[PDB]
Design a binder for this molecule. Structure first.
Ligand SMILES: Nc1ncnc2c1ncn2[C@H]1C[C@H](O)[C@@H](COP(=O)(O)OP(=O)(O)OP(=O)(O)O)O1
Ligand SMILES: [Ca+2]
Ligand SMILES: [Ca+2]
Ligand SMILES: [Ca+2]
Ligand SMILES: [Ca+2]
Length: 509
DNA sequence: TCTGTGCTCACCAC
DNA sequence: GTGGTGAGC
């Protein structure tokens, strides 16, 4: 008999509950050196070209070819050039003050000797739109290939591979395990059993068939301990996932040119670590059996977990007297029976004045949740559902001003054109994300004076029509900046040190 | 193979 | 209400 029940297997077929099954097959896919690849691709360059994406004098993304020279985000452009003279730095696109479009100034930048070809920080604003556009393309590819996709960030997704896995397992007559061997023949038992319907759902699954063990994982399977690859149905699901996953990743590579790193496990949190384990263009598979091996390999700490890499993670180091090293094993070793034992410990720790509820990130009421979470996380069995992102509350386009650039109403107005164009662009990236029409009803203009005093005017934006139009947003912005200018006469004001436009009260009609 | 004249977003103590 | 801040790119 198998460790797993029919109920846990069948649940993969359900988007709502697939993640809760210990048989969950989840993937985390992260674009390698994302802005550098998008610039590489746009400029017709190879994967092995040492390109660097730059903002002013900083490096914001470093291609894996560039990293062979010890270049990193830490280096300034000039520094990175001393490591590799053949470096290809590419500035992000920029808005020019007073223009409503961004553009690329190729062969320009602070590293370029010629004074003619610079991108002055004083007169320009970075646009990340090209990276947003590319991310959106990636997203349409992922969404086409998988019925539940979470957009974790601009270059990251989670995929719930449940349906695909389950359906491939049960109904896929195409697939070849080997020459003269197919899935339908290798899995005839469980497939006949499933259609048969004669199982009780809490009945355990039949033992995997010897013939299934020839099923190949795609990518790098992390078992330091040389465990057997396929011992149970979870390993069958994960292996099927890995194949499905490579194909999706090859899609991204073939349509858009981007390499990715990918983590495959039964859990999001573990997927996130695993995608990051090998870069670039690698798939890391972590089987449930190798979970402990993986978490204990020495690269990870309590602090590695998502939402525990912040101050809350620190408090947990202090509040559980955690070792600086091997803290994952530690937490599992200290409370090996159940969430309860650690919950109680937290409660006991809380009361003695080792801390005050003024600077604390730990909620006493919901202390169980924390204990379940850590207990689960430490064994790599804490499964969160994939979710969509919260609707957008506000969008701001800002410029921190240096110099005397903003010395007048017309200067402001020139910066406003840029903010307004950028915001208009971003409304659209959202209209396409939501496939619904999105209009902001309120605008706010803010500025900091020469002496850093804040001025702000906030109000409704009138549309002479049903459709949002950029020029209407600008018009209200102009009025507000004009009113604020009047407000500041004979007071510290110009030259300004900051100016921004924030939209809010989005109607998602 | 963390960082600064980065950039943005959301939260909640004052 | 929001500036300072925390967090994430
Ligand atoms: N500290 C930062 N400053 C500016 N831009 C950043 C920073 N961190 C990330 N970004 C931008 C540029 C990155 O290409 C993109 C995605 O971030 P991230 O995935 O962490 O790194 P990456 O894709 O550049 O490298 P990796 O291959 O390690 O994922 O977001
Ligand atoms: Ca990345
Ligand atoms: Ca990332
Ligand atoms: Ca097992
Ligand atoms: Ca302590």
């Amino acid at each position: 008999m198998s460790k797993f029940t029919w109920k846990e297997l069948i649940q993969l077929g359900s988007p709502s509950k697939a993640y809760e099954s210990s048989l969950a097959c989840i993937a985390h896919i992260d674009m390698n050196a994302f802005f550098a690849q998008v610039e590489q691709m746009r400029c017709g360059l190879s994967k092995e070209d040492p390109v660097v994406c730059v903002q002013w004098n900083s490096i914001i993304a470093v291609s894996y070819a560039a990293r062979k020279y010890g270049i990193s985000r830490m280096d300034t452009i000039q520094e990175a050039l001393k490591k590799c003279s053949n470096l290809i730095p590419i500035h992000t696109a920029v808005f020019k003050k007073g223009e409503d479009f961004w553009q690329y100034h190729d062969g320009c930048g602070s590293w370029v000797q010629d004074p003619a070809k610079q991108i002055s920080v004083e007169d320009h604003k970075v646009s990340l739109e090209p990276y947003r556009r590319e991310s959106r393309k990636a997203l349409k590819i992922f969404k086409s290939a998988c019925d539940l996709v979470e957009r974790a960030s601009i270059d990251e997704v989670f995929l719930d591979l449940g349906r695909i896995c389950f359906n491939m397992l049960m109904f896929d007559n195409e697939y070849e395990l080997t020459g003269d061997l197919k899935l339908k023949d290798a899995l005839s038992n469980i497939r006949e059993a499933f259609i048969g319907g004669n199982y009780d759902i809490n009945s355990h699954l039949p033992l995997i068939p010897e013939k299934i063990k020839s099923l190949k994982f795609e990518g790098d399977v992390f078992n330091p301990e040389g465990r057997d690859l396929i011992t149970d149905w979870d390993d069958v699901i994960l292996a099927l996932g890995s194949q499905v996953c490579k194909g999706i990743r090859d899609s991204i590579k073939d349509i858009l040119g981007y390499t990715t790193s990918c983590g495959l496990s039964s859990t999001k949190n573990v997927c996130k670590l695993a995608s990051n384990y090998k870069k670039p263009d690698a798939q890391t598979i972590v089987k449930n059996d190798c979970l402990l091996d993986f978490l204990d390999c020495g690269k990870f700490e309590i602090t590695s977990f998502w939402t525990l890499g912040g101050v809350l993670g620190k408090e947990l180091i202090d509040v559980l007297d955690l070792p600086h090293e091997n803290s994952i094993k530690h937490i599992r070793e200290t409370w090996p029976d159940n969430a309860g034992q650690l919950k109680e410990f937290l409660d006991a720790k809380v009361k003695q004045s080792d801390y005050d509820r003024s600077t604390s990130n730990i909620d006493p009421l919901k202390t169980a949740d924390l204990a379940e979470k850590l207990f689960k996380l430490s064994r790599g069995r804490y499964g969160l559902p994939l979710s969509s992102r919260p609707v957008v509350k506000s969008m701001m386009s800002n410029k921190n001003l240096r110099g005397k650039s903003c010395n007048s109403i017309v200067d402001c107005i020139s910066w406003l054109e840029v903010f307004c164009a950028e915001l208009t662009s971003r409304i659209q990236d959202l209209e396409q994300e939501y496939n619904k029409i999105v209009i902001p009803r309120t605008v706010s203009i803010s500025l900091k004076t020469k002496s850093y005093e804040v001025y702000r005017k906030s109000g409704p934006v009138a549309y002479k029509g049903i459709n949002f139009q950029s020029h209407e947003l600008l018009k209200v912005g102009i009025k507000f900046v004009t009113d604020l200018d009047i407000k500041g006469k004979n007071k510290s004001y110009y030259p300004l040190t900051k100016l921004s436009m924030t939209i809010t009260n989005f109607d998602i009609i």
